[PDB]
Amino acid sequence: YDIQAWKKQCEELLNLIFQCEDSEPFRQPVDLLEYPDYRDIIDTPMDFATVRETLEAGNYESPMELCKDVRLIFSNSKAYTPSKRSRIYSMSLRLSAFFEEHISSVLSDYKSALRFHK
Numbered sequence: 692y693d694i695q696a697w698k699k700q701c702e703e704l705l706n707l708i709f710q711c712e713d714s715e716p717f718r719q720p721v722d723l724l725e726y727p728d729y730r731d732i733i734d735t736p737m738d739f740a741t742v743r744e745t746l747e748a749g750n751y752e753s754p755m756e757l758c759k760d761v762r763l764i765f766s767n768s769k770a771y772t773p774s775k776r777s778r779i780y781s782m783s784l785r786l787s788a789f790f791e792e793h794i795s796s797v798l799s800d801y802k803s804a805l806r807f808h809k
């Protein structure tokens with residue numbers, strides 16, 4: 692029933708994600724010199740460095756808010772890819788499966804802790 696425990700659990704999951712080779716295209720903002728049409732397709736850019744900095748600044752109130760931004764990384768890859776067989780999109784699907792498998796207990800424990808508090 693620790694209402695604060697999610698934050699260190701999200702720090703440790705981001706460290707696992709940074710060690711995975713599948714995260715490399717997603718660690719920093721998409722390079723607009725490499726992809727000059729990116730902002731004609733994608734309204735809200737997001738990357739794992741941005742998510743870690745927001746967490747470390749004390750600018751997430753809950754793990755649900757962190758989860759919305761990580762899901763935006765994956766939806767941006769699905770919207771920008773020219774093919775469902777592309778290399779980088781293929782990497783996004785494996786990393787999304789890994790993230791969802793690990794975030795589920797973080798979300799459940801936080802929501803349970805908050806119900807006990809209230």
Ligand SMILES: Cn1nnc2cc(CO)ccc21
Pocket residue numbers: 716721726767768769771772773774777778779780
């Ligand atoms: C950043 N991102 N996410 N998905 C992408 C797909 C491509 C091309 O297959 C290029 C860049 C991508």
